[PDB]
Write a protein that binds this ligand. Structure first.
Ligand code: ATP
Ligand code: ATP
Ligand code: ATP
Ligand code: ATP
Ligand code: MG
Lengths: 339, 70, 48, 56, 258, 59, 111, 373
């Protein structure tokens, strides 16, 4: 009749196990101090269908709305849609197709992947892996490129920056988004956190303009805490991205927080040639190209402008349905008195 | 300067009922309990005829009207 | 009687609404007389 | 869970339940009324709401 | 009285304001009328708005199709099917299926509602019977003949149809006709062309050359227009042989100048 | 590990030919990368392309 | 009853805190200025008084505020509802540090 | 004569209407049911079988599934006559009934009123062939906005990326808004105008939200054409200096850019950026990876002026014969808007002459007046 006991336990555990917090544990056997959505506080001398030890103050557990007995616990929850934003459909690009930039990719790939895969070398050397990384995209050229290309490893998760400033005017909160984000990263396997447009946060922290400022400073300080506090934070990899290089928080700055601040320079002639080649790889280019001389014509054509120009050249040829490069209608796609 | 002793020292030296209040511990919870609890403490003070109602610094409340708002 | 500005501007049911009602009632007085008084002229209402 | 507020007579106490309402209830005998005091927490029962067990 | 109201409808079928207000009068009749006049009104409503499922008329027809009187309900349900004839409007179909659900225990009503969905889906909304024609200018004699036969038959739905004879719907089928804009050019060549289609605007009187197109929806040649929308073709691509574009048309390939 | 330089660098960029090219010779123009870049472009663009159906056909 | 740790960004403050926490071996409460909450009202002071009550019950204890800059702010007047709430939270801290909440066996750290 | 006949017959109509009202009597007062009948007993019964609440489902834990629901009362429920388990989605609007709380009907996502009415589903009343003086610009816009949509297999065969992002700029008033309206009317895709002012709110948090919901709405829709106007208002130079308090607009602009092109595909959304001062525009936004085919509207030439003139002359009551090329010649350096205002002035001059014909003389007088002012 043990089975019959199990089935009747199941049936009396109908289904709508109203979920409740596990706010506190005690003993006298152990007990529970659960709290419910409907603000209430139930002491349970008998906790219920749980080991009464895996519980820990702060947890979500199903409960019988009437019996108030802790039923099957549920995995922790993450709010502010941190979980929803923390998704990624394995960005399709597989190669590191960027262009001339080589040292930047070198250091970033090393400091990120090598700890992940070949941590054997690090442990043998007795070295904790490289510290949190920053990646200056002053113009943005190649910034998201490197991020997305890095989104081609074996398997991991990437926490994008998306509205950490989602704070209520009425004081708001110290980036509960940040709290939940770091919690999720901590709980999941080796994870990475791409702080996009980090400039949106971060500052000298002393300017006293007005409200909203101070909210941004609490969020910043929450970031600082999340990686500099009484926490090893071993299983995390922060990669920051910013363009307002100069104006940023001196503490957020580096040295346990954002080290190895890779820099994105203006592509040289070779780099411009390489990027235009990369974007033209799939282009139906005729067997006649002056790629290098087009790179020379670039004349400070750093950013995605190369991609935009290849697209505009495609449309230009498509005026007439061709597959060849005029090489000068290409400059006019690029874009009196004396002369 | 030493306001808080003068407070505590009279709270001891006195031979009368005394009630201490915090500057702003009466603003919390669902809407509308602040007025209720302030009138409650004043009712208790009335009940204790020789009552002395000391409140810690006030600045966090009553500093300004802050004009009409919503 | 604070200067009519900031929020509400007639969309608020507060002292601004009371000011609007007062102005509507005023205009008309025949022989009654009204003496407003204040410490500072800085704050004033154009409508009033 | 709710904290007692006053030792009303002997078998009567005013307890403000955390959910918000304030009640007056009597306590099971085996509770050493001396123990509980203004501010002490207690676990009232569902139906009758008699003080069953004081808590720290 | 039923035939009298049907004749009021059979006199008012053209002028848009007159038809709208004939519907208003028929609503007056149904509300302050005998049960006979009540059964009669929905048929006249269908006559006025054939294949023209406007929201107000649909509301009224559903209103007086959920009526207690079975004959009133029959007339109203079939009238609503007719006003939805060959339109496939989502709102109309949803209302229709809800009414079918409600009349779950009524066999004849369920039959009629099934025919109502069939009407809403005529040729999957490709064939639309219409007395009027040619921008509300031409009178369809055969169409009016068939429609009047059907509606006279439905004047007494209980005996005429719920019984031996139910093929006046086939008479209506014969009366059917499409609404379509194949631009089959010279030698029936299916020359395609971009056409801007929009609800008519009653060009008379307005300023300049009124934009008969409301909500320009350039949709090539194989379009179906609608109960009351017309086309303007394009800037100067071709020269249509008719300015009332409808059905089989020819487009002279002689633009004055590109 | 591309033939020029016989490079084995961990940074080695691993291309659609699965080959950690020389840092300076990672490009298809340089190493005759035998991949159908253009065909993949056509397929992907066809998949992702939005087409306006004019929203007139209906059941 | 309290100590302060003037420090630029990384002088050794948090690691110092770790070392003292592992050394003393009594109760430790490492708390951060990211304790601000809002439910159409303020409860930061309530959380603060919960902290202080916990400590007083666990008399032997080291509370450690860190990043006191944020909540510490300043007594700005007529700033905004946010400024008033933050200064109220600060004021709870002041009242429960000094005042009738006088302690005997707890120790406070700031950085 | 005719006027008096009107007045009489409209008097008859007003009398008839008041007579109907007084005779029969239909009114509402407070709430009403003017439409006869409306009996809804079955509606009540099914309402009882329904009248459900809704919340936001969170997670389906197990593979009988465990849906998690949050509102003023948390819950963990599942199962329903509804199928397509959670419609292969979690963060929807569940729409679950009471009474054991296991029966559901999916619902669309809640969106703030701002974006709800910014959807602007109306179709502006403009069409091509009503545009003169910017034939090249309209050609570019037509290409970019239509070729990817109209018979676009030819646009994919070449293995060329589909351009996405166009910024219209030029002097104040050149037919940019007119061309935007024309494209909106002609297009058949989820069109969404945007007003910059509606993105500026009380302190941080508002603009970024509304932008994100707008973007996810566009993504949910099959294919979107978004039509930002007032870009000069929304988004500017990133420099702070004294904007340390005004950084809210810059923040919102930053989120806008990230959604335009960040660490995620942006989708089949084509952006139109209306402006007339294309210099203060922020470099990050102006990056051609987000505004591919910037278009410049210039003052019309003589032929464009003439074409706009005849377009505006489309209206009736105009002269039988006018000589539009000379009209354009007399008005050089004139915007198409100024051509429109010249036609308006000619009409007003005809009225102020009590003339029902707009003569070339009227056009000349209007041109003289506008030139002098
Ligand atoms: N070196 C590069 N290789 C490939 N694509 C590039 C490169 N530089 C720019 N791009 C193009 O730029 C777009 C991605 O933006 P990118 O990563 O350069 O950041 P950004 O938008 O300029 O950043 P920021 O926010 O700092 O302005 C894509 O179109 C990508 O093709
Ligand atoms: N007369 C005094 N004798 C001794 N200590 C004093 C005296 N006045 C002030 N103090 C010092 O300050 C404290 C008493 O003042 P306390 O700081 O409690 O209140 P306060 O000076 O009014 O300022 P606050 O209200 O901001 O705390 C004591 O702890 C002592 O260190
Ligand atoms: N004096 C030090 N001796 C040894 N390691 C140190 C020292 N200071 C910092 N570190 C290293 O830096 C990290 C801890 O930083 P630290 O405790 O100095 O931060 P902090 O001063 O609290 O920073 P912040 O002021 O920016 O909030 C650990 O990696 C620790 O090894
Ligand atoms: N190419 C054109 N064809 C016809 N009318 C035109 C043309 N260009 C301008 N107009 C006239 O000018 C006015 C168009 O103003 P619109 O709002 O479209 O301009 P804009 O370029 O967006 O700039 P602005 O907002 O500064 O006026 C209307 O009067 C329109 O008739
Ligand atoms: Mg304009």
């Amino acid at each position: 009749k043990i089975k019959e006991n199990s089935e009747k336990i199941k049936v009396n555990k109908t289904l709508p196990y109203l979920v409740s917090n596990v706010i506190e544990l005690l003993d006298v056997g152990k007990c529970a101090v659960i709290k419910t959505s409907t603000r209430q506080t139930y002491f349970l001398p008998v906790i219920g269908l749980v080991d009464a030890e895996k519980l820990k103050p702060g947890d979500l557990v199903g409960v019988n709305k009437d019996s108030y007995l802790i039923l099957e616990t549920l995995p922790t929850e993450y709010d502010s849609r941190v979980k929803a934003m923390e998704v990624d459909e394995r960005p399709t690009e597989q190669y590191s197709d960027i262009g001339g930039l080589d040292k930047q990719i070198q250091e970033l790939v090393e400091a990120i992947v090598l700890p992940m895969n070949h941590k054997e070398k690090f442990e043998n050397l007795g070295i904790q892996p490289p510290k949190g990384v920053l990646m200056y995209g002053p113009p943005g050229t190649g910034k998201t490129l490197l991020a997305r290309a890095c989104a081609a490893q074996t398997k991991a998760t990437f926490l994008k920056l998306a509205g950490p400033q989602l704070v209520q005017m009425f004081i708001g909160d110290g980036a509960k988004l940040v709290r939940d984000a770091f919690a999720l990263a901590k709980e999941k396997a080796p994870s990475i956190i791409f702080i996009d447009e980090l400039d949106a946060i971060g500052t000298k922290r002393f300017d006293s303009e007005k409200a909203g400022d101070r909210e941004v400073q609490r969020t910043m300080l929450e970031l600082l805490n999340q990686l500099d506090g009484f926490q090893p934070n071993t299983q995390v990899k922060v990669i920051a991205a910013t363009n307002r290089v100069d104006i940023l928080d001196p503490a957020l700055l580096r040295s346990g927080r954002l080290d190895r601040k890779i820099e994105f320079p203006m592509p040289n002639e070779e780099a411009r040639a390489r990027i235009m080649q990369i974007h033209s790889r799939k282009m139906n280019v005729s067997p006649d190209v002056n790629y290098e001389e087009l790179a020379r014509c670039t004349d400070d054509f750093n950013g995605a402008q190369c991609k935009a120009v290849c697209v505009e050249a495609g449309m230009i040829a498509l005026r007439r349905g061709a597959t060849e490069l005029t090489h000068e209608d290409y400059m006019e796609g690029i874009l009196q008195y004396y002369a | 300067c030493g306001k808080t002793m003068l407070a505590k020292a009279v709270a001891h030296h006195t031979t009368a009922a005394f009630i201490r209040v915090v500057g702003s511990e009466f603003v919390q919870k669902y809407l509308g309990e602040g007025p209720r609890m302030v009138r409650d403490v004043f009712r208790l003070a009335k009940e204790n005829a020789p009552a002395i109602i000391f409140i810690d610094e006030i600045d966090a409340i009553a500093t300004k009207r802050f004009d009409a708002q919503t | 009687g604070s200067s009519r500005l900031e929020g509400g501007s007639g969309g608020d049911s507060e002292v601004q609404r009371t000011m609007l009602e007062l102005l509507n009632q005023l205009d008309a007085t025949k022989n009654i007389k009204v003496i407003m008084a204040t410490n500072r002229i800085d704050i004033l209402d154009s409508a009033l | 869970v709710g904290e007692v507020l006053k030792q009303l007579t002997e078998e009567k106490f005013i307890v403000k339940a955390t959910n918000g309402p304030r009640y007056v209830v009597g306590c099971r005998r085996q509770l050493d009324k001396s123990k509980l005091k203004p501010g002490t927490r207690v676990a009232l029962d569902m139906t009758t709401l008699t003080i069953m067990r004081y808590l720290p | 009285q039923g035939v009298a109201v049907l004749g009021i409808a059979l006199i008012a079928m053209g002028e848009e304001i007159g038809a709208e207000m004939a519907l208003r009068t028929f609503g007056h009749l149904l509300r302050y009328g005998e049960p006979t006049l009540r059964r009669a009104v929905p048929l006249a409503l269908a006559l006025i708005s054939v294949s023209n499922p406007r929201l107000n008329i649909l509301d009224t027809l559903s209103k007086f199709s959920h009526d207690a009187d079975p004959e009133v309900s029959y007339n109203s349900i079939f009238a609503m099917g007719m006003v939805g004839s060959g339109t496939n409007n989502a709102r109309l179909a949803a209302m229709l299926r809800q009414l079918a659900q409600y009349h779950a225990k009524d066999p004849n009503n369920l039959f009629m509602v099934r025919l109502a969905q069939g009407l809403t889906h005529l040729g999957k909304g490709t064939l639309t019977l219409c007395p009027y024609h040619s921008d509300r200018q031409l009178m369809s004699q055969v169409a009016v003949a068939g429609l009047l036969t059907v509606l006279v038959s439905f004047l007494d739905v209980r005996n005429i149809i719920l019984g031996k004879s139910h093929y006046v719907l086939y008479g209506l089928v014969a009366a059917m006709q499409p609404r379509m804009l194949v631009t089959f050019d010279e030698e029936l060549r299916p020359l395609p062309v971009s056409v801007r289609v929009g609800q008519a605007v009653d060009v008379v009187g307005q300023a300049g050359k009124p934009k008969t197109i409301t909500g320009f929806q350039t949709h090539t040649t194989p379009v179906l227009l609608a109960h009351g929308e017309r086309a303007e073709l394009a800037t100067e691509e071709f020269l249509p042989v008719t300015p009332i574009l409808e059905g089989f048309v020819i487009l002279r390939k002689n633009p004055n100048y590109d | 590990c591309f033939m020029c330089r016989k490079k084995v660098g961990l940074t080695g960029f691993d291309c659609r030919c699965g080959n950690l090219f020389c840092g300076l010779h990672r490009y298809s123009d340089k190493h005759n990368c035998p991949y159908d870049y253009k065909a993949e472009a056509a397929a992907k663009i066809r998949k992702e392309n939005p087409v306006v159906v004019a929203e007139k056909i209906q059941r | 009853k309290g100590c302060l740790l003037y420090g630029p960004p990384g002088t050794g403050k948090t690691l110092l805190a770790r070392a003292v926490a592992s050394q003393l071996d009594c109760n430790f409460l490492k708390v951060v200025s990211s304790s601000i909450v809002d439910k159409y009202i303020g409860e930061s002071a309530r959380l603060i008084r919960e902290m202080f009550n916990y400590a007083r019950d666990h008399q032997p204890c080291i509370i450690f505020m860190d990043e006191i800059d944020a909540i510490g702010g300043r007594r700005f007047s007529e700033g905004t509802s946010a400024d008033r709430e933050i200064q109220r939270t600060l004021m709870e801290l002041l009242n429960q540090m000094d005042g009738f909440d006088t302690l005997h066996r707890v120790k406070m750290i700031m950085a | 004569t005719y006027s008096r006949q009107i007045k009489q017959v409209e008097d008859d109509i007003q009398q008839l209407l008041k007579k109907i009202n007084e005779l029969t009597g239909i009114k509402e007062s407070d709430t009403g049911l003017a439409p006869p009948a409306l009996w809804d007993l079955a509606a009540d019964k099914q309402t009882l079988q329904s009248e459900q609440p809704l919340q936001v489902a969170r997670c389906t834990k197990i593979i009988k599934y465990i849906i998690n629901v949050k509102q003023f009362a948390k819950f963990v429920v599942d199962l329903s006559d509804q199928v397509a388990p959670t419609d292969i989605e979690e963060g929807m609007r569940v729409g679950v009934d009471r009474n054991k709380y296991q029966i559901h009907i999916p619902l669309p996502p809640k969106i703030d009123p701002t974006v709800t009415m910014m959807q602007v589903e109306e179709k502006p009343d403009v069409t091509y062939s009503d545009v003169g003086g910017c034939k090249e610009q309209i050609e570019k816009l037509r290409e970019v906005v239509e070729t990817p949509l109209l018979h676009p297999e030819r646009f994919v065969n070449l293995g060329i990326e589909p351009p996405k992002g166009v910024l219209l700029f030029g002097p104040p008033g050149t037919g940019k808004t007119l061309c935007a309206r024309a494209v909106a009317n002609r297009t058949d895709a989820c069109f969404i105008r945007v007003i910059g002012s509606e993105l500026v709110q009380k302190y941080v948090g508002e603009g970024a939200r509304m932008v994100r919901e707008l973007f996810e709405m566009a993504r949910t829709k099959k294919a979107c054409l978004i039509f930002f106007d007032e870009i000069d208002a929304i988004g500017g130079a990133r420099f702070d200096d004294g904007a340390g308090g005004d950084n809210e607009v810059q923040r919102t602009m930053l989120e806008l850019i990230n959604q335009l092109d960040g660490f995620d595909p942006r989708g089949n959304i084509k952006v139109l950026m209306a402006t007339n001062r294309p210099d203060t525009l922020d470099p990050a936004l102006m990056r051609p990876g987000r505004l591919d085919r910037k278009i410049e509207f210039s003052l019309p030439d003589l032929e464009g002026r003439t074409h706009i003139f005849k377009i505006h002359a489309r209206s009736m009551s105009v002269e039988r014969d006018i000589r539009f090329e000379l009209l354009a010649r007399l008005c050089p350096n004139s915007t198409g808007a100024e051509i429109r205002s010249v036609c308006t002035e000619a009409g007003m001059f005809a009225i102020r002459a009590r003339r029902k014909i707009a003569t070339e003389k009227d056009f000349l007088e209007a041109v003289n007046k506008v030139i002098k002012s």
